[PDB]
Amino acid sequence: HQVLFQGFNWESWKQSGGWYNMMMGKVDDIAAAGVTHVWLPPPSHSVSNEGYMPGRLYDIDASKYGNAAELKSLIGALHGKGVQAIADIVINHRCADYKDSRGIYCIFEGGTSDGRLDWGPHMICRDDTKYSDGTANLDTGADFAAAPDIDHLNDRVQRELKEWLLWLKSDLGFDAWRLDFARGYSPEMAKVYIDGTSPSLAVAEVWDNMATGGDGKPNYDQDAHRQNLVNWVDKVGGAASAGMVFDFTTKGILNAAVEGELWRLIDPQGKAPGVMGWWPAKAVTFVDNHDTGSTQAMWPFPSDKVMQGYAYILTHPGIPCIFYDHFFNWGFKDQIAALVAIRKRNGITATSALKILMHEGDAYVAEIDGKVVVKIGSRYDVGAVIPAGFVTSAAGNDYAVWEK
Ligand SMILES: [Ca+2]
Ligand SMILES: [Ca+2]
Ligand SMILES: [Ca+2]
């Protein structure tokens, strides 16, 4: 059994009294709903309020979400309810505390007294010329515009970053990682950090655009999009690795499929169309996150169909991730908890078997592990396709679940 929960949104850092202190009050509900792991925001000092422009990586106390004590206390309360804590790991780029001779900020401070992470411009990807001293290796991945990109090929970098990651585990209690902007560096570099710190999982944010066409809708075929993600996992180590990816292929396809185009939910081989259908043990599915949804709304799930999205991900193979706002702010708490209870009581996991029974415009129906049948779409009756022995288990706006 595995169910993730994103424990923040783009606005969390503004929570009065502190985001982590507030969350202390949400732990019991999260645990009771069957959640096994909670993804928390970038914990370190960051030039940006949300945390994605990290500087003094050991300086947790400067976080806007809360200080090291509050964080340890939230993680401790999670662990007391059997729930793990995932840290949002932002290491593609980093901001320096001090300017050098050139008057450029490229003199970093790790946040401790000694020299851990007190990097110089040699640690900056030589091709991020806006900050480097041209002596480093070339960036192994894409560049982040606003801050110096770290040269992950630099040996000191690898060592001090792994040491820091192990300290987030040892001194704060984190169990796993969410790798921010994973396109920023190579899976080979990702492998170094994952292999070097044995996290229970390392879900990577590898977000590429979806092949679209003409009007703007995404194409029905998305093998290219999910091949890339599958390939990333292979290079990070495949099955031997704790590494995995957010299933952005499924996210894109589902975004469109619910708008009366559920025929999109199956590939020509009769398999789920996203990473879920090719490597479900490595697919972390979701409805919306702090970028796609929330107040940034880069790619929001149709707001009137959000529960259909959860009926899909929570009953299906792949590891589902519930979004904070959806569980707590939209009034879907009991409905979401009930879907997770169905998943759990039926022993459904990321690798459960999927048999699609109907993939039409207003009706998607599938059977999982031959124990649960779910239906999404506006079609009133799909009874003819329900196997013998199933009885309605749960239902809401345009979705239904049956169990034997
Ligand atoms: Ca220092
Ligand atoms: Ca950069
Ligand atoms: Ca980079």
Beta bridge pairs of residue 138:
none
- Amino acid sitting at position 161: L
- Resolution of the solved structure (Å): 2.0
Catalytic-role residue among 50, 180, 325, 367: 180
Q: Fold match between 2-347 and 348-404? A: no
120 neighbors 129 (Cβ within 8 angstroms): no
Query: Which ligand sits nearest to residue 94's alpha carbon?
Result: 2
Whole-number Å distance between alpha carbons of 194 and 192: 6
Biggest alpha carbon–alpha carbon distance for the chain = 76
Whole-number Å distance between alpha carbons of 389 and 146: 58
51 neighbors 13 (Cβ within 8 angstroms): yes
How many angstroms is it from 150 CA to the middle of ligand 2? 8
How many angstroms is it from 119 CA to the middle of ligand 1? 9
Beta bridge pairs of residue 89:
179
Q: Domain 2-347 belongs to what topology?
A: TIM Barrel (3.20.20)
- Residue 355, token pair as written in the block: 């048999």
How many angstroms is it from 300 CA to the middle of ligand 2? 27
- Whether 205 is catalytic is yes
Beta-carbon neighbours within 5 Å of ion ligand 1: 109-110, 118
- Amino acid sitting at position 159: R
- Residue 316, token pair as written in the block: 């299906």
Domain ranges for the chain:
2-347, 348-404
How many angstroms is it from 316 CA to the middle of ligand 3? 34
Which among 202, 122, 185, 182 is positioned nearest to 156, based on CA atoms? 122
Distances in Å between the Cα of 165 and the Cα atoms of 23, 183, 204, 251 are: 23, 20, 15, 29
- Whether 180 is catalytic is yes
Q: Is the dihedral of CA 258, 233, 55, 169 positive or negative?
A: positive
Find all residues with CB under 8 Å of 353, minimum gap 6, and list them: 317, 368, 369, 370
Residue 139 burial (C-beta neighbours within 10 Å; 0-12, 13-18, 19+): buried
181 neighbors 144 (Cβ within 8 angstroms): yes
Query: Which ligand sits nearest to residue 150's alpha carbon?
Result: 3
- Please give, one letter per residue, the 3-state secondary structure of the chain: CCCEEECCCCCHHHCCCCHHHHHCCCHHHHHHCCCCEEEECCCCCECCCCCCCECCCCCHHHCCCCCHHHHHHHHHHHHHCCCEEEEEECCCECCCCEECCCCCEEECCCCCCCCCCCCCHHHECCCCCCCCCCCCCCCCCCCCCCCCEECCCCHHHHHHHHHHHHHHHHHHCCCEEEECCHHHCCHHHHHHHHHCCCCCCEEECCCCCCCECCCCCECCCCHHHHHHHHHHHHHHCHHHCCEEEECHHHHHHHHHHCCCCHHHHCCCCCCCCCHHHHCHHHEEEECCCCCCCCCCCCCCCCCCCHHHHHHHHHHCCCEEEEEHHHHHCCCCHHHHHHHHHHHHHCCCCCCCCEEEEEEECCEEEEEECCCEEEEECCCCCCHHHCCCCCEEEEEECCEEEEEC
Long-range contacts made by residues 123-126, C-beta under 8 angstroms, separation at least 24?
A: 123/150, 123/151, 123/154, 123/156, 123/157, 124/148, 124/149, 124/150, 124/151, 125/149, 125/150, 125/151, 126/151
Distances in Å between the Cα of 252 and the Cα atoms of 97, 222, 241, 299, 305 are: 38, 9, 26, 8, 14
How many angstroms is it from 150 CA to the middle of ligand 3? 6
Residue with tokens 């044995």: 198
CATH 2.60.40.1180 fits 348-404, yes or no: yes
β pairing state of 84-89 and 176-179: parallel
Catalytic-role residue among 205, 247, 267, 288: 205
Distances in Å between the Cα of 238 and the Cα atoms of 20, 31, 208, 244, 284 are: 34, 30, 20, 8, 15
How many angstroms is it from 118 CA to the middle of ligand 1? 5
- Amino acid sitting at position 188: E
Query: Which ligand sits nearest to residue 53's alpha carbon?
Result: 2
How many angstroms is it from 8 CA to the middle of ligand 1? 30
β pairing state of 391-396 and 37-40: unpaired
47 neighbors 95 (Cβ within 8 angstroms): yes
How many angstroms is it from 124 CA to the middle of ligand 3? 9
The C-alpha angle with vertex 235 and arms to 153 and 313, in degrees rounded to 5, equals: 120
Which among 188, 159, 186, 164 is positioned nearest to 177, based on CA atoms? 164
Which among 280, 67, 43, 306 is positioned nearest to 178, based on CA atoms? 43
How many angstroms is it from 111 CA to the middle of ligand 2? 21
Neighbouring C-beta atoms of residue 11, cutoff 10 Å: 15
How many angstroms is it from 288 CA to the middle of ligand 2? 27
- Residue 301, token pair as written in the block: 């799930």
Query: Which ligand sits nearest to residue 117's alpha carbon?
Result: 1
172 neighbors 60 (Cβ within 8 angstroms): yes
- Amino acid sitting at position 315: T
Distances in Å between the Cα of 102 and the Cα atoms of 121, 128, 131, 216, 314 are: 11, 15, 10, 46, 53
Report the first-to-last Cα separation within the chain, whole angstroms: 19
Find all residues with CB under 8 Å of 309, minimum gap 6, and list them: 254, 258, 287, 301
Neighbouring C-beta atoms of residue 126, cutoff 10 Å: 18
Distances in Å between the Cα of 67 and the Cα atoms of 16, 71, 100, 113, 176 are: 14, 6, 30, 18, 19
Whole-number Å distance between alpha carbons of 226 and 209: 11
Which among 227, 228, 234, 276 is positioned nearest to 254, based on CA atoms? 276
Q: What are phi and psi of 75, to 5 degrees?
A: -60, -40
197 neighbors 241 (Cβ within 8 angstroms): no
Query: Which ligand sits nearest to residue 139's alpha carbon?
Result: 3
Whole-number Å distance between alpha carbons of 341 and 143: 42
Query: Which ligand sits nearest to residue 137's alpha carbon?
Result: 3
How many angstroms is it from 183 CA to the middle of ligand 1? 29
